[PDB]
Structures are given as C-alpha cells and as structure tokens.
C-alpha cells in the first residue's frame, strides 16, 4: 500500500539541508536565497528553525508550482517564506546575503564570475556535491549516513583562485 509507484524520485534528508545552512552561517537576521527548492524545504527549514529574517525559494513550475506553497503552511512559516517564479535572470539575488545551489542538472552553465557581480562581497554560497572551477572553496566537508556520503562546498565572494 505504501511505495507501490516505480522507484519514485527520493529527496535528499533534511540533515543534508541543515548542514548546508550552519556553514553559511545564516541567522536570524541574514535572509536565505535559494533555486533549488522544489517544495519549499530549503527555505522553510531555515525560517521554520534558523527564523532567518527573509527566505525566498526561486523557480518555476506547474504542478510543483503548488506544492511548494502548500508545504509553506504546513509549517506555519508564512511570512518568511515565499516562492518567485520567472527567469533566472529577470529576477535578481544581488540583495542575498546567503544563497544555496541545488540542481539535479548534470551539465549546465555556472556563471560563476556572474556571481562576483551579481552578489556583494562576503555573501555566502554553497554549492551541492559538485566544486566550483577556478574558484578556491573556504570550507569543505562530507557528511555519511549509512552507506552513502554527501559534500558541501561553501565560498566567499570577494575573493576566488587565491
């Protein structure tokens, strides 16, 4: 009765999430910009426990599009909360102090000097299991849960290569 459908698509544990926040160092009064929602659970652990100041989930979609606001009052975290959809590139992250990557995209543009731009120097970014080229990573760790393991790259805009 219980995972009947196909090998069905298993997000990551929220441990993984949790992680990835400690080391940005996000606090109550830093705001939390993230593209890899896809249900809200990047963002809504942070306000829900971090009680960031301002956390806001970036995509687009259709029937995910709803799933996402919905796990927001589940957790009571409206407010703080919140889903933008659009381009990448229409809406802008310059005013994110800390951000977050998280894509299942094999293969796909970085834009990792854009960053340098786009972001102000000493915001905090943390990328999912894949390293940044070229850019020289302030932290890095792996977590192990069972039998399988996870990376974190954190970095600091301001200064790259070395």
Same mark, same amino acid.
């Given at each position: 009765?219980?995972?009947? $459908?196909?090998? *069905?698509?298993? $997000? ?21 910009? @993230?593209?890899?929602? =896809? ?17 806001? %989930? ?9 799933? @996402?606001?919905? &796990? ?8 703080? @909360?919140?889903?933008?959809? =659009? ?8 005013? @994110? ?15 990792? *000097? ?6 102000? $120097? ?13 850019? &020289? *990573? ?7 849960? %069972? ?10 805009? %301001?200064?790259?290569?070395?």
């Amino acid at each position: 009765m219980s995972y009947v $459908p196909h090998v *069905p698509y298993v $997000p990551t544990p929220e441990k993984v999430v949790r992680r990835m926040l400690e080391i940005a160092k996000v606090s109550q009064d830093d705001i939390v910009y @993230a593209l890899g929602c =896809g249900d809200g659970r990047i963002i809504i652990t942070a306000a829900k426990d971090f009680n960031v100041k301002k956390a806001v %989930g970036v995509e687009i979609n259709d029937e995910r599009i709803r799933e @996402a606001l919905a &796990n927001i009052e589940k957790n009571g975290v409206t407010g703080r @909360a919140s889903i933008v959809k =659009g381009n990448f590139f229409e809406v802008d992250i310059s005013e @994110a102090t800390v951000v977050t990557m998280f894509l299942l995209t094999n293969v796909n543009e970085m834009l990792k *000097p854009k960053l340098e731009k786009e972001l102000k $120097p000493g915001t905090r970014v943390v990328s999912h299991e894949f390293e940044i080229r070229g850019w &020289n *990573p302030k932290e890095v760790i792996k977590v192990e849960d %069972g039998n399988m393991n996870h990376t974190v790259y954190l970095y600091v805009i %301001g200064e790259h290569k070395a």
